[PDB]
Amino acid sequence: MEYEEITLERGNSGLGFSIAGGTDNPHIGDDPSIFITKIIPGGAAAQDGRLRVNDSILFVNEVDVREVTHSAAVEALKEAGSIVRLYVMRR
């Protein structure tokens, strides 16, 4: 699994991509692995074009989502200020 960072400017609507896989919502088989599900077109994520869906989030600015709920990961993107470098995993 390759780890890449994505600097995203949290626009008016937000970052611009929804993630699923946290400890509360096992989007995956059955683990706290946080990974994206879909990036919303017109948002900071879709406008930037640095992040890709299904990417398993690693860090958010300075937050580790190793064992955090899907909402905690989501909240990370929301708590990343504005332009935040988000880390993800891609095997």
Curated annotation (Swiss-Prot):
Palmitoylated. Palmitoylation is required for targeting to postsynaptic density, plasma membrane and synapses. Palmitoylation by ZDHHC2 occurs when the synaptic activity decreases and induces DLG4 synaptic clustering. Palmitoylation by ZDHHC15 regulates trafficking to the postsynaptic density and function in synaptogenesis. Palmitoylation may play a role in glutamate receptor GRIA1 synapse clustering. Depalmitoylated by ABHD17A and ABHD17B and to a lesser extent by ABHD17C, ABHD12, ABHD13, LYPLA1 and LYPLA2. Expressed in brain (at protein level). Detected in juxtaparanodal zones in the central nervous system and at nerve terminal plexuses of basket cells in the cerebellum. Expressed in cerebrum. Expressed in hippocampal neurons (at protein level). Isoform 1 and isoform 2: highly expressed in cerebellum, cortex, hippocampus, and corpus striatum. It is found in: Cell membrane; Postsynaptic density; Synapse; Cytoplasm. The modification Phosphoserine is found at S13, S82. It comes from the Eukaryota. Residues 5-91 form the PDZ domain. Postsynaptic scaffolding protein that plays a critical role in synaptogenesis and synaptic plasticity by providing a platform for the postsynaptic clustering of crucial synaptic proteins. Interacts with the cytoplasmic tail of NMDA receptor subunits and shaker-type potassium channels. Required for synaptic plasticity associated with NMDA receptor signaling. Overexpression or depletion of DLG4 changes the ratio of excitatory to inhibitory synapses in hippocampal neurons. May reduce the amplitude of ASIC3 acid-evoked currents by retaining the channel intracellularly. Belongs to the MAGUK family. Interacts through its PDZ domains with ANO2 and NETO1. Interacts with KCNJ4. Interacts through its first two PDZ domains with GRIN2A, GRIN2B, GRIN2C and GRIN2D. Interacts with ERBB4. Interacts with KCNA1, KCNA2, KCNA3 and KCNA4. Interacts with LRRC4 and LRRC4B. Interacts with SYNGAP1. Interacts with ASIC3. Interacts with SEMA4C. Interacts with CXADR. Interacts with KCND2. Interacts (via first PDZ domain) with CRIPT. Interacts through its first PDZ domain with GRIK2 and KCNA4. Interacts through its second PDZ domain with the PDZ domain of NOS1 or the C-terminus of CAPON. The PDZ domain 3 mediates interaction with ADR1B. This is Disks large homolog 4. It comes from Rattus norvegicus (Rat). The chain holds residues 61 to 151 of 724 of the full protein.
